[PDB]
Paper text:
PLK4, and this interaction targets STIL to centrioles. allows homo-multimerisation, the interaction with the PB3 domain of PLK4, or both. structures and interactions of CCDs and PLK4-PB3s in humans and flies. STIL/Ana2, which can then interact with and recruit Sas-6.
structure of the strand swapped dimers is unambiguous. similar to that seen in the mouse PB3 crystal (MmPB3, grey cartoon). mouse PB3 domain behaving as an unusual strand-swapped dimer. crystal structures of the human (this study) and mouse PB3. monomer, with the multimeric forms dominating.
Numbering used by the authors:
A (entry chain A), B (entry chain B): 890 to 966
The structure:
């Protein structure tokens, strides 16, 4: 019935937003925020962080790799 | 210094989770929840929804198109 035509997002450090445009012309803008962060070390100890907890520097630099901006367009003919 | 090797996510209607694995073996699991939803109709009237607010059926069916599960692997040699 209804499907996606164009998408795009911009994710910051502690939140993100997704923009979507459908075939019928409607648009959906979804704002999302981080509720919890889980980090398992390479040797196997797990550590969960909360919505308000402070993040260490070596965790922040790894979270920076997730921050990105995407754009995709349906390009017929 | 540190970059991403494998990613994956599973998005529900009002939230989502992203799984990421780095080259050094570390893993990041990010839980996110929707804070606000903006819907502009094809003719142009906007409507904003809240973090907890209920959604009409024609909004839920369009949000269902966003729900997806992705998985990506780095495949050297």
């Amino acid at each position: 019935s209804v499907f996606v035509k164009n998408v795009g997002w911009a994710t910051q450090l502690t939140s993100g937003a997704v923009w979507v445009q459908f075939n019928d012309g409607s648009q959906l803008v979804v704002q999302a925020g981080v509720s919890s962060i889980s980090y398992t070390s390479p040797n196997g100890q797990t550590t969960r962080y909360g919505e308000n907890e402070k993040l260490p520097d070596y965790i922040k630099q790894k979270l920076q790799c997730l921050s990105s901006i995407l754009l995709m367009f349906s390009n017929p003919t």
